C-alpha cells in the first residue's frame, strides 16, 4: 500500500495526537496533581508514547505531503527535508527520552517520573520549534 | 483540566487511526508481501497496538461525546452505553489478542505472526460491528 499523501498526513497527525493524550495523562498525575497518582496508568501512558516514538514515523514523511490535508492541512515546514541531520538528531533524542520515560514509569517513583517526563516534553518541543508551523 | 467532549472524540479517533496505520504495516509484511518482512518493524508496529489497547480508552467515553466532532463527527453508536458487560468482554479480548500479537512479533515466527494478526483483526471488527457507524 503506497499510501496516498493525505493518508500519510492523517496517520502522522493521529500518531502525534495520540501521544498528546497520553502525555496529558502523565501531566495531570505527576506535574499538576489534578488526577490521583497511579503507577499503572502512568506506566500505560508512558508505554504508548515510547511505542509510537519507536514506530518509525519517518516512513510518513515525503515532500509531496507538504501543505496536504490529513485531518487538517499539514503543519509540516519544508526545511524538514533540507535539515535532514537535524531531524535525525532530534528524532533519535526523542526515542531515547521516550524509552527512558517508560523505564522510569515502570519503576513508579513519582519524582523520577516527573523529571524524565520533563525531558520528554523538551524533546517534543525541540522538533516543533524547528519543523512545525504553530498555525 | 478535564477533557472537553470534542477532545475526547479527537483523542479516541487519533488512537484508533494510529493502530490502523500500524496494523497496515504488519498486513503489508506478513499478509500481502508488498513490504519486505522486517523483524524489528513488525514488532515495533505490534507494540504500538498493544500499548494503545492497554491505554485505558474507556476514559474517553461518555454520553456527552455522542455526535460530537473531533477530527470528524463521532461514529460512536449510542447502544454502547447500554452494553457495559459486552464492551468489557470485547475490550478485554482485544487486550488479550493485542498482547499476544506483541509477544509473537518479538519471537519472530512469521506464520504465527500472520495467525495472531488475524485474531487481532477479528477483535477490531467485533467492536466496530456493534458500536461504530460504518462508512
Ligand atoms: C519531530 C521529530 C517531532 C517530534 C519528536 C514530535 N513532534 Fe509533534 N508534530 C511534529 C510535526 C511535524 C507535526 C505536524 C504534523 C502535520 O502533518 O501536520 C506535529 C504535530 C503534533 C501535534 C498535532 C497533530 C495533529 O493532530 O494535527 C501534536 C498534538 C503533537 N505534535 C504533539 C507532540 C508530542 C506530545 C510529542 C512528544 C511526546 C511530539 N509531538 C513529538 C513533529 C514532531
Ligand atoms: C471497541 C472497544 C473498539 C475496538 C477494540 C477497536 N475499535 Fe476502532 N473504533 C471504535 C469506535 C467506537 C470508533 C469510532 C470513534 C469515534 O468517536 O468516531 C472507532 C473508529 C476507528 C477508526 C477511525 C477513527 C477516525 O480516524 O475517525 C479506525 C481507523 C479504527 N477504529 C481502527 C481500529 C483498529 C485497527 C482496531 C484494532 C486494532 C480497532 N479500531 C479496535 C471502536 C473500537
Residue numbers in the entry:
A (entry chain B), B (entry chain A): 1 to 135
Quote the original article.
Thermophilic Hydrogenophilus thermoluteolus cytochrome c′ (PHCP) exhibits higher thermal stability than a mesophilic counterpart, Allochromatium vinosum cytochrome c′ (AVCP), which has a homo‐dimeric structure and ligand‐binding ability. A spectroscopic study clearly showed that some ligands were bound to the PHCP protein.
It formed a homo‐dimeric structure, the main chain root mean square deviation (rmsd) value between PHCP and AVCP being 0.65 Å. In the PHCP structure, six specific residues appeared to strengthen the heme‐related and subunit–subunit interactions, which were not conserved in the AVCP structure. PHCP variants having altered subunit–subunit interactions were more severely destabilized than ones having altered heme‐related interactions. The PHCP structure further revealed a ligand‐binding channel and a penta‐coordinated heme, as observed in the AVCP protein.
